[PDB]
Design a protein around this ligand. Structure first.
Ligand SMILES: *[C@@H]1O[C@H](CO)[C@@H](O[C@@H]2O[C@H](CO)[C@@H](O[C@@H]3O[C@H](CO)[C@@H](O)[C@H](O)[C@@H]3O)[C@H](O)[C@H]2NC(C)=O)[C@H](O)[C@H]1NC(C)=O
Ligand SMILES: *[C@@H]1O[C@H](CO)[C@@H](O[C@@H]2O[C@H](CO)[C@@H](O[C@@H]3O[C@H](CO)[C@@H](O)[C@H](O)[C@@H]3O)[C@H](O)[C@H]2NC(C)=O)[C@H](O)[C@H]1NC(C)=O
Ligand SMILES: *[C@@H]1O[C@H](CO)[C@@H](O[C@@H]2O[C@H](CO)[C@@H](O[C@@H]3O[C@H](CO)[C@@H](O)[C@H](O)[C@@H]3O)[C@H](O)[C@H]2NC(C)=O)[C@H](O)[C@H]1NC(C)=O
Ligand SMILES: *[C@@H]1O[C@H](CO)[C@@H](O[C@@H]2O[C@H](CO)[C@@H](O[C@@H]3O[C@H](CO)[C@@H](O)[C@H](O)[C@@H]3O)[C@H](O)[C@H]2NC(C)=O)[C@H](O)[C@H]1NC(C)=O
Ligand SMILES: *[C@@H]1O[C@H](CO)[C@@H](O[C@@H]2O[C@H](CO)[C@@H](O[C@@H]3O[C@H](CO)[C@@H](O)[C@H](O)[C@@H]3O)[C@H](O)[C@H]2NC(C)=O)[C@H](O)[C@H]1NC(C)=O
Lengths: 346, 346, 346, 346, 346
């Protein structure tokens, strides 16, 4: 028996009329290409650019009746990746590519095998930098949905149809972890059939649900913003004689809170709307600033201190600074309920 | 009937005299190439570099009378993208490229189809990083106009003319959003015919109007600069005895305002002119600095306090600090009218 | 005798039936490819991306019985790297590539030599940017294990098996040093045989143990955080009359400690868990903040100063500020034992 | 008549002895190649790297007597850019390339036309990142001269000579603007003939004079450094009783001036010499620091206050603080004359 | 006479038995390739990556007796760079490449000429990004030695030997300057012959001595750290009554010194050892911190002030603050001698 590389030159040579520019079942039913991916690496999910980098094995399966053999004994024949220019292949591309490349280290990372009835398996390795728009309205508590979609470029719907296979259309590697996110296991699979003025082109897509890890933002930003509000509360047990101190405590804390609020969006997209980390920093900016205006209502209410009213204005100040030892640690805890319950129902 | 790949080798082979180096209608009327684009992705509009990255489908249509057939039955014939070196194609380029590339993932993302009368549709996928000069004179309220222009490189006006088609010359995708901008729907289309010393070359261009989203800059910079001015106003209800406090309030606020003014242009081009965020920060730098010079006109006007004039200088200070409890919250509101009305009329 | 380049065209030409698409020992036992690497450069170990860049010489050895000669006199024959498309080579790739390239400066950096019995040595130069997940739970005291794994792509286990050679399977260069890490000499070598739905593919891997250098983090972060805690201890020898000073010392130190705690993770991945530099900064944030609440328990306990109890409240404050001259330099040293012993046992 | 692509295969085919490896006028006078450029884009002038990115049309004109025809009727013949490997072209390169590339979007952006007497026009599009050393001794007021030089690589002076054409050797586009610089219209053109140990090679160069825009640095750095000096002058009208204030004004301003001086070189090369922004920041650092030492000469000269000398030391302090209300706003204005006149004469 | 391009096809064609895969003097003495470089550009010496970018002309000279001619009249023959695939060339590479590329703008920047006796000159243009480990123990005063080494890849020592030529083996361009360094003129040239398990391979290297420019670090870091120590010395002439001031001067200066010490290594590798800028910042951190503990030994030594000992404790404080007006400006000047003499002897 002749070896398979001299046998595939009989199937696909100038004899037997095989032509790699012509799809299987020409002037007939469309080619049913069935696809599944295997994610090796995932991550570097940037939000200034609103993209993410994935590293997949793209497997494609179709049927080519011109490649059906009956004389060679074994059930499968592998091509050299040097000879991939000699079969028909689907012109799959990604509708949100934003740059991608193959991998060509020590050999083209391409796989091709042909069964007896003409089933062709074609597996390649691609690195993609896919685009996904980020919905950052509830920013440390959001569930991002970033997609990837696989279209035909030249063949319309009456010539080539993509499908996901029903035997696990998206596999993920064994210990694939993410530093900021967790990848939920349920991955939605649906159609995205495009209509241009050239024609209608097939499309299938896969949704990936990315839920954040709140444990980072809870340490860097939610706790040090909770402490500086408590620095405003220690201004109330100091008497109304250390006016360089309680104003110096009402200023050094209200201006380091502006640093926390400006530093809370140092590596984010410049979005128009207000997000959930913003209505935490701006409300904690209000408590650190209303404790300064509390002292201006103490230093002025005792400045106006004819023998009873000048004693009445000393004890009026000693009552307005005993409500703020309760009202500010009780309004701030009502906000701690109406914030975390609000961003746990959604 | 022979298949179309063996039929296009009869139209474009060494027989029938077709030559891909010679334009249609040679030594005759010029080739009328009609163009339209389809924007898949838009954005990453940087202003240090003054560029933006677009991802388009570039469709070109012309007429090639040497490709008119009459024997094959179907109305259109697709080329393999492997055989694109064998037709004539227009040498379109972008006059403000600044780097660009094709997309070659799983197949060259190129489309080509030939009708019966010789109409050729040619659609490719390009990622561009186009250059546009930014007019940042009114910076959070500006309407940027960034263009893209499509020229011929080798053929002059008497050989090749570009046109926009009248059936929607610029299509935009379904949910194409931008993080900082909104893309207005009216897109201007006009001619940009170039004259060099080599000849005159055809050119068509498309204007994209990009209006910003003020909602980001309104949160990070316009509101925290509005608060620090109000920190200067709480210095007036404190009596003229806490001189370490009111000077400490006239210094910690006037030096965190320099941080806000220096941090207002941290990721901008170093433009010569003064912009609208600069005449907000510099005027709010004046109110936070004139409240310090108000106190120097209080601490010195009471320092000069022979029994009536030493009582006259105590109540003169208690009058200059009661005008500044009104005049500074009234001059700052006249500026709030003369700023936002000024940048809403233009 | 004819020269070896005209002798290798007799071994691998169209005569003698050699075919570079067919592995040695076809329809027989699998090819035993034995591998070893030589690390030229190592480092740029980033942790935002969780990757590292290595620069290796990849040596592969197998046996090809079709390349066994007996007539040429010398024992080895070198190929030109121009003629590397004419032998069989294993399709080795790296399962955590994340981008890689060859080196082609003045010549393809490729080596190939063929012995008399058919032993083929094949050595190439590769730059890899390999992926490794970082376990940063004990961050300046961790031992990172970053791997590299060498798989087949097209040939399954019944056709091609990778092995490490027993004569030093990983060599490292002479003076290969790292700025942040030390590379331990014991390098683990084990199998990583993959199972896909395509088949089972061979895999071998090498573990590199990277232990950090604590001497950098001990200078920038552990010592300046140890000083600011001692700034809180100098607040206790100042009497309870400099209330703008001891509050100004209880605020300027507790807000520069927030800068140290926010600046301790300026170039790190946003990990969910709490790490060993975080429970040093957050506990030293507690000592610099509990020295402020100590003074509020002094300024209020003397504010309540009918002739004995108003003398009893002056000396009660002079006792609570003599326990904090001992208890705070003794609780902080118990934490210095329970921190460094905790991160030296593991 | 045969078409020009079948006519240029008669001029440059295997017949008629044309050889693209042999220059025109071989073993004769040297080839006179005349050059001019057209700048499309200019800018991104970095100074850490000391480079700038230009985007040019490089036009070259020479005479090739082997390409002179007399039978074809028209006066010019265009080549396909596919056929540019078949003529002789000069091996022009840039002696300060630092990386460059062509542009190959929808067609090689190359132009070639041949007149009847053999005049060959050759125009290509190049993006360059050219190197220029920056003379930053007077940094916001400098006139940078950045060059570009065009050499031969293989042909010496007795075989190939470059010239600039006299009809406008450097054209600039219509609205080519720069964010930081202005490009002066007079562009110097001179020879730069190189002598190596291989031979002497031709070279022509073009100087571009880049004058900065002082209006950016005048807003971010020269005005906020002028204000903090005036903050030191408001310390003099405050009496010598607010010692926490005037020292707090002599410290918060002298340490925010160190931030201005360290932040004045945040994105600059680390040059050895002292530049004009440095002797503004260091002298304004002296005025903000000598107003602190003025107060130490007041707080100590009144501390020494036997009945006349203890009254003589109260009014001696009230005289040293009335010279500094004049001498510091008069020495600082003499420096404002001796700085701007010094950097306007040069 | 036939032209040289038709004469080099007689020397190197299929006739006369020339084969570009076989080195000169085969089965004889080794090929003596002699090398020299010409540095066009140098710099961008990063230390986070510990690399530097050079731009060289690499000249190689060897003898090929198969290229000796005697019939053509002229003494040298130039090859087209299109025909460089047809001679033998040495497989030189750089053992610390870390990425490199050729230059291919308007022509391959390659030069080749063949003399009558067979001497071959081969000059190419390479951009390298070479690796050098940085010894930063004395950081602003160090002399860095960064190397480049030129090895053979496929040919061992018994087939190919590299040498430096004795006529100026490293030339540097005319005005090649560096922003941070100066390149010393004496360049060491020595052998670096490698031994692998494949064989022994030739290697030559060139050392470049890079001495820094201290004038940058003397302005940004050594002088502003010298001023803040002098801010601690102005705390001593202020009396022991401005306790919010002298503590406010002992805190605002000791916490801006932590900013100077943390900002002194903002763009450096994270090295384990302590460097010369670190033992300047940490010792100046000690003087700014020991002036705070001096005041705690004044405010407590006067707090203990039965009629003589309560007068003895007032004048004891007025003596401990008169030693620190001398001892701190004398210990700091002994350190100024023992630092600069220590880093000038080495
Ligand atoms: C690729 O898959 C598509 C399905 O998405 C196939 O299209 C469908 O094929 C059937 C034949 O099996 C067509 O005929 C239908 O048959 C049923 C009986 O099973 C009959 O009741 C219907 O009235 C109809 O005649 C069907 O029209 C067709 N549908 C479409 C939308 O094309 C296609 O045949 C597959 N092609 C290959 C090459 O496997
Ligand atoms: C490509 O489109 C251009 C239009 O931009 C065509 O150019 C014009 O073609 C007409 C023929 O249809 C030329 O002749 C004119 O005809 C009118 C009658 O319709 C007559 O009244 C005029 O006096 C004139 O003879 C016209 O000169 C020409 N204009 C230009 C500026 O070239 C061109 O024919 C089209 N080419 C192809 C191949 O479709
Ligand atoms: C490549 O290496 C593998 C080992 O990993 C070789 O596989 C083994 O080869 C032996 C023949 O030497 C096979 O036969 C066995 O021989 C022993 C006697 O030595 C006998 O007692 C056993 O019952 C068995 O018959 C063995 O089955 C085989 N093992 C596997 C898993 O394949 C292989 O031959 C090597 N190939 C080449 C081309 O060197
Ligand atoms: C390319 O341009 C150069 C000029 O840079 C030409 O070189 C010069 O050519 C002239 C001939 O026109 C040579 O002869 C001289 O002629 C004058 C009369 O015009 C005579 O008085 C002189 O004594 C001399 O014989 C001249 O030597 C030569 N100069 C050099 C430096 O080569 C060159 O001919 C041009 N080549 C082509 C192909 O156009
Ligand atoms: C390339 O250069 C090397 C030198 O590094 C040459 O190697 C040496 O060549 C000499 C012949 O000139 C060999 O023979 C010696 O000759 C002296 C007399 O001059 C004799 O006294 C010695 O006993 C010895 O026979 C010498 O062995 C050889 N050395 C080595 C290490 O190979 C080489 O010939 C040069 N090759 C070419 C092609 O130029």
């Amino acid at each position: 028996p002749m070896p398979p590389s001299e046998f595939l030159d009989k199937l696909m040579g100038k004899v037997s009329g095989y032509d790699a520019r012509i799809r299987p079942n020409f002037k007939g039913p469309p080619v049913n290409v069935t696809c599944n991916i295997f994610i090796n690496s995932f991550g570097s999910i940037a939000e200034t650019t609103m993209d993410y980098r994935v590293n997949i094995f793209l497997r494609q399966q179709w049927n080519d009746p011109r490649l059906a053999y009956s004389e060679y004994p074994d059930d499968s024949l592998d091509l050299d990746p040097s000879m991939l220019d000699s079969i028909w292949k689907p012109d799959l591309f990604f509708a949100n590519e934003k740059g991608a490349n193959f991998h060509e280290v020590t050999t083209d990372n391409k796989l091709l095998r042909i069964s007896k009835n003409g089933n062709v398996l074609y597996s390649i390795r691609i690195t993609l930098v896919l685009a996904c728009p980020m919905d950052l309205k509830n920013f440390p508590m959001d569930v991002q949905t970033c997609i990837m979609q696989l279209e035909s470029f030249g063949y319309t719907m009456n010539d080539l149809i993509f499908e996901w296979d029903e035997k696990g259309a998206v596999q993920v590697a064994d210990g694939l972890t993410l530093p900021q996110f967790i990848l939920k296991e349920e991955k939605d699979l649906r159609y995205c059939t495009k209509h241009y003025n050239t024609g209608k082109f097939t499309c299938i897509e896969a949704r990936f649900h990315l839920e954040r890890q709140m444990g980072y933002y809870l340490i860097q930003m939610y706790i040090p913003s909770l402490l500086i509000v408590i620095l405003s509360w220690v201004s109330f047990w100091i008497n109304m004689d250390a006016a360089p101190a309680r104003v110096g405590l009402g200023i050094t804390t209200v201006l380091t809170m502006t640093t926390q609020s400006s530093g809370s969006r140092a590596s984010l997209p410049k979005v128009s709307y207000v997000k959930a980390i913003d209505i935490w920093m701006a409300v904690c900016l209000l408590f650190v600033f209303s404790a300064l205006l509390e002292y201006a209502a103490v230093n002025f209410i005792a400045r106006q201190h004819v023998e009873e009213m000048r004693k009445l204005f000393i004890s009026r100040a000693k009552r307005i600074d005993t409500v703020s030892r309760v009202a500010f640690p009780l309004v701030f805890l009502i906000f701690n309920i109406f914030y975390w319950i609000t961003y746990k129902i959604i």
